[PDB]
Amino acid sequence: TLTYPFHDWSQELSPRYAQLRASDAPVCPVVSEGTGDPLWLVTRYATAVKLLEDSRFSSEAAQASGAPRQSPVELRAPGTRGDAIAMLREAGLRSVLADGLGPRAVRRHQGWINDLAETLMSELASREGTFDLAADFVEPLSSALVSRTLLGELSADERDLLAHCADTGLRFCGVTHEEQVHAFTQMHEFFLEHARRLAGTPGEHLLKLIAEAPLSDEALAEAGSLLVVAGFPTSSGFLCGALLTLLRHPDAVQELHAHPERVPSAVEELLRYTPLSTGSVKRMATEDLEIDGVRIKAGEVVMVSLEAVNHDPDAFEDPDVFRPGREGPMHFGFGRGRHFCPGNRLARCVIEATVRAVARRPGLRLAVAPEEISWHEGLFFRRPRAIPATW
Ligand code: HEM
Ligand SMILES: O=C1N[C@@H](Cc2c[nH]c3c(F)cccc23)C(=O)N2CCC[C@@H]12
Ligand SMILES: [Ca+2]
16 A cells, blocks of 8 residues: 655655664555556665566566556657667667777776866855855766766756756656656657757767667667766766765865775675665566565566665664765675666766865855755756855
8 A cells, every 4th residue: 555656855864764674674665656557665785686686577678668666657759669778789889889988988087077076166166145056066967977078068058958858757756657658759769850960060979989889769768868877867866966975075085185095895785875766677577586585476576776775774873864975785785786877987976076175175065954955846857946155
């Protein structure tokens, strides 16, 4: 009878996650609020590891059209396949995805990424009065990341369209079903017209490397939509949430100011501590399976809340405490197993650049109380409406 998700749109995690984590079962039945579909939900680290590293629990089958699902609408343009990352790896493009997303891409981009974060912070520090870290730092930094490393150079209008399509499509509520679907239609039709054009510009952005490698307009458009939904609301949501975390922990920031070698530990702890998705990664049983004693029938979908797992006290001592340099296991902020986020290198690079830009300038603080922060309600990927801030 428990419906999913739990409407915890701010950084305050729903109490249900601890309730289920403490209950007497390793997986719990829920019902999708948006479709009425029955789903399984995992909240414990030990169980999550087992699930996400068993390839008989399939991601592609859970993303497929017609699957039991937590989203109110299918997350694809009608009539399209909607599984770009599989299609690209199927077309033999793993080596290109590594060149575009891996350590060589980070070496290519980290210089300007850090120059940009400093330039943005410096411009804000030269201003008299208050400013908005969401609109004045995160949005330009994450837009530049998406443009220069993933899509190619976008005009302001094009960026606004894609950002709007992501915010409208990647929702549990707040928009009608047909508005939600049409957001994917608009983005797909944008890339049907513009994906190849974007590839024919200067740069080494991933969509270029995909278009240049040894692909139909429909496949390249699916790649563009993938890069928007995978890179834009995630990075912008996470950077906003990590800034809120840092601004609430001035002692930790002061330690990073004094000991810049401790920033990478703080980046990893932010990935554990700062919640992002309001839903769950999901996988469909491709045959009858058993997880810690509970039978999962072929075709049933099992969900893992990364947020729940990252706050599991059996995994992390004092899980609700922001503690850079804690010595526990790998966080789940990028997932686990074969589908571990391939954007994790660029993500870490932009997070580190943000953490260092903040640590170099102590005194940065919120210009309102944490409870005065307003949150977009119903996004898959949490994001505050604004982060009023000041020195
Ligand atoms: C910055 C650019 C990013 C790109 C290009 C990117 C790309 C991707 C792609 C293509 C996938 C699908 C992999 C698959 O299904 O095999 C993925 C998964 C994932 N990403 Fe990212 N990502 C980015 C940023 C982020 C950030 C900032 C976070 C979190 C802080 C994140 C968290 C995740 C997680 C948890 C998954 C796993 C989903 C699952 O297991 O089903 N990503 N990412
Ligand atoms: O909310 C949602 N999460 C993702 C899974 C996820 C968890 N964390 C993530 C992250 F940080 C980056 C990318 C993805 C995720 C998913 O499958 N969704 C289906 C329907 C609802 C939506
Ligand atoms: Ca079905």
